[PDB]
Design an enzyme around this catalytic site. Structure first.
Site, PDB file in Angstrom:
ATOM      1  CG  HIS A  96      45.505  42.008  45.830  1.00  0.00           C
ATOM      2  ND1 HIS A  96      45.487  43.174  45.432  1.00  0.00           N
ATOM      3  CD2 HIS A  96      46.009  41.110  45.017  1.00  0.00           C
ATOM      4  CE1 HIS A  96      46.266  43.228  44.419  1.00  0.00           C
ATOM      5  NE2 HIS A  96      46.594  41.755  43.976  1.00  0.00           N
ATOM      6  CG  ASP A 117      44.947  46.001  47.545  1.00  0.00           C
ATOM      7  OD1 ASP A 117      45.358  45.156  48.404  1.00  0.00           O
ATOM      8  OD2 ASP A 117      44.935  45.733  46.202  1.00  0.00           O
ATOM      9  N   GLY A 172      50.842  40.012  38.725  1.00  0.00           N
ATOM     10  CA  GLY A 172      52.389  39.963  39.451  1.00  0.00           C
ATOM     11  C   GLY A 172      53.127  41.251  39.399  1.00  0.00           C
ATOM     12  CB  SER A 195      49.378  42.974  42.684  1.00  0.00           C
ATOM     13  OG  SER A 195      48.422  42.800  41.981  1.00  0.00           O
ATOM     14  N   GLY A 196      50.973  45.273  44.303  1.00  0.00           N
ATOM     15  CA  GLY A 196      51.749  45.708  45.488  1.00  0.00           C
ATOM     16  C   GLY A 196      52.907  46.483  45.472  1.00  0.00           C
TER      17      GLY A 196
END
Ligand SMILES: [Ca+2]
Lengths: 4, 240
Positions: free
Chosen positions: B45, B93, B186, B188-189
């Protein structure tokens, strides 16, 4: 979603 | 990261900042894990938007020169083919970014250790989330990299009605949910680092929190389960  | 503490500069050297070009500058948007000298693992995402992205390794403070950063463009983006932006709860994801250059390793820049395929953590396993995401719900990004202790919540509990119900899948890891500490926008990932047999490994890619708020009791932060995608990751790196 967190994300940015 | 809500309820975090500032990480030491050399604690989490596989953490990267994924940034996009905004006017004449760059803005942090997501975290990532450096997994090869020229590959970063992040959330699908994070790269839905048609932006120009760069990766920063050796980053600590987004608002000052640390004297350790290496800045590298993103050359290729490979999103998991089952990812659907309309359906984060379906999973998948995860995305890999091939960097334009191979980065140089040192105390601040190291590959993240990944778990063996299929590995599931016992309930209440010790982990830290790291990132520069919001420090409060509807707050602002951190300047310095933050860490928070988020113990896992196993699938049986996480997928129970008072937690995430059917929203959580076995391809995900849940962690936290104490109402104080959490990922936030912020983060995420980025990595969830969990201690197993004396070694921290990256068991999660930060994916989502509740629409109600970041630190919500019984809504632990949810991560893509890295150990569900080892073959996928290997196949992408081998074919690119
Ligand atoms: Ca910096």
């Amino acid at each position: 979603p967190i994300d940015f | 990261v809500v309820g975090g503490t500032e990480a030491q500069r050399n604690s989490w050297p596989s953490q990267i900042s994924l940034q996009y070009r905004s006017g004449s500058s760059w803005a942090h948007t997501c975290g990532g894990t450096l997994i090869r000298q020229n590959w970063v693992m992040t959330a699908a995402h994070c790269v839905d938007r048609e932006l120009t992205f760069r990766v920063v390794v050796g980053e600590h403070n987004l608002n000052q020169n640390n004297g350790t950063e290496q800045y590298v463009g993103v050359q290729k983006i490979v999103v998991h083919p089952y990812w659907n932006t309309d359906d984060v709860a379906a999973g998948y994801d995860i995305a890999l970014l091939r960097l334009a250059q191979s980065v140089t390793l040192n105390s601040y820049v190291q590959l993240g250790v990944l778990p063996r395929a299929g590995t599931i953590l016992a309930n209440n396993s010790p982990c830290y989330i790291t990132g520069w995401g919001l420090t409060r719900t509807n707050g602002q990004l951190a300047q310095t990299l933050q860490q928070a202790y988020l113990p896992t919540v196993d699938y049986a509990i996480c997928s129970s009605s008072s937690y995430w119900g059917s929203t959580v899948k076995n391809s995900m890891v849940c962690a936290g949910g104490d109402g104080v500490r959490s990922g936030c926008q912020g983060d995420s990932g980025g990595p969830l680092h969990c201690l197993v047999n004396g070694q921290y490994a990256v068991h999660g890619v930060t994916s989502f929190v509740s629409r109600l708020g970041c630190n919500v009791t019984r809504k632990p932060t949810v991560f893509t389960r890295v150990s569900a995608y080892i073959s996928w990751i290997n196949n992408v790196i081998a074919s690119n």
